[PDB]
Amino acid sequence: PMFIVNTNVPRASVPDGFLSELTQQLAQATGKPPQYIAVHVVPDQFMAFGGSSEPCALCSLHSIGKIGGAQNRSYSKLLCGLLAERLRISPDRVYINYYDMNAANVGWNNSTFA
Amino acid sequence: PMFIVNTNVPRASVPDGFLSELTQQLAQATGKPPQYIAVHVVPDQFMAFGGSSEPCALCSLHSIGKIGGAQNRSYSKLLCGLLAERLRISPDRVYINYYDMNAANVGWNNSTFA
Amino acid sequence: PMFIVNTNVPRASVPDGFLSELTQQLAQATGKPPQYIAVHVVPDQFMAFGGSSEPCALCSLHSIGKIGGAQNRSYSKLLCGLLAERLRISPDRVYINYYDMNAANVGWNNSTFA
């Protein structure tokens, strides 16, 4: 799995530990080993949500399987929570796009996961 | 809806009010209220289009529905027009990927849209 | 086609000629004129792979067709090889997401490719 956060919250406001926390939290949430979890946080963005420049986030979660209606509800509660507590972003100013990737469509280590 | 623009045009060349203009125009074109509209502009990129580093843009529009042949043609004219007028980018150096998202795959406010 | 590379490798460790090399090798690999190829390299990112901040890359390849099981294995061999030779990133710390885009869903030059 891979989790990307783009946000207008400044770099300095991203707490020590946040990548490692995202990694352990997603490894737990997805049931995948942490060695397979990639995390990417992109602060200081020029972005707006609802027309306002108050803190906000645009995020993506890509996984081969482990993506569905109930699972994504449980991801968004987990992830919004972490962004609220760590980054001080309101859950109603967060978007998370979920992608169920086909193994053949994910390359790694000179090949794909097919 | 969410609209992202990545461009090699420098930050200083993005005119004031550019995020609010995208938000208003995308509310109108999509039928969604400006409240649900997210916009993200990423200048100063290291990027090439056709092997050339003249001004260019790679862009994404995600929406739950409101994506289709005619609508996308209409979005592209809207949006190339704004990048031409506001950022001095030629329309033939713009790519815009459209994504019709399933409601169960968009997270927001601790839940999903399904 | 469009190829995006997000990496924590610093800007100064990206060798001169990289975008042109990527454009040339993707033209060859996808069978498409280099005029249609767009390439985007984002260095200096705050990311982790498998909970390590050693060099890593998260990438995407979008193409209208020329996407599939075998083709994507071949892409991954070519693309990992380049990120290992040029950026000194281990192929097992690279992900590349492949997207077969519908022509209706790729905007360009005020319209779409449909």
Residue numbers in the entry:
A (entry chain B), B (entry chain C), C (entry chain A): 1 to 114
Q: What does the report in the manuscript say about this coordinate set?
A:
Macrophage Migration Inhibitory Factor (MIF) is a ubiquitous multifunctional protein and a key player in the inflammatory response and innate immunity. MIF has two enzymatic activities: an evolutionarily well conserved keto-enol tautomerase activity and a thiol-protein oxido-reductase activity that is mediated by the C56ALC59 motif. X-ray structural studies have consistently shown that MIF exists as a homotrimer. Each MIF monomer consists of 114 amino acids and is composed of two anti-parallel α-helices packed against a four-stranded β-sheet.
To elucidate the role of intersubunit interactions involving Leu46 on the structure and stability of MIF, we compared the structural stability, and biophysical properties of wt, L46A, L46F and L46G mutants at the secondary, tertiary and quaternary structure levels. To understand the role of Leu46 mutations on the three-dimensional structure of MIF, we also determined the crystal structures of L46F, L46A and L46G huMIF at 1.70 Å, 1.70 Å and 1.60 Å, respectively. Similar to the wild type species, Leu46 mutants crystallized as homotrimeric proteins with dimensions of approximately 35 Å×50 Å×50 Å. In agreement with our previous structural studies, X-ray crystal structures of MIF variants demonstrate that the Leu46 mutants conserve the same three-dimensional structure pattern as the wt protein. Static light scattering, in agreement with the analytical ultracentrifugation data, demonstrated that wt, L46F, L46A and L46G exist as stable trimers. Finally, crystallographic data and enzymatic assays do not show any drastic conformational change of the catalytic site or activity of MIF upon Leu46 mutations. Using hydroxyphenylpyruvate as a substrate, we showed that all Leu46 mutants are enzymatically active. In our case, chemical shift measurements demonstrate an extremely high similarity between L46A and L46G huMIF, whereas the L46F mutant exhibits a slightly different chemical shift pattern. Taken together, our data suggest that the intersubunit interactions involving the residue Leu46 play a key role in the structural stability of MIF and provide new insights into the role of a novel intersubunit hydrophobic pocket in modulating MIF’s conformation, stability, and potentially its receptor binding and biological activity.
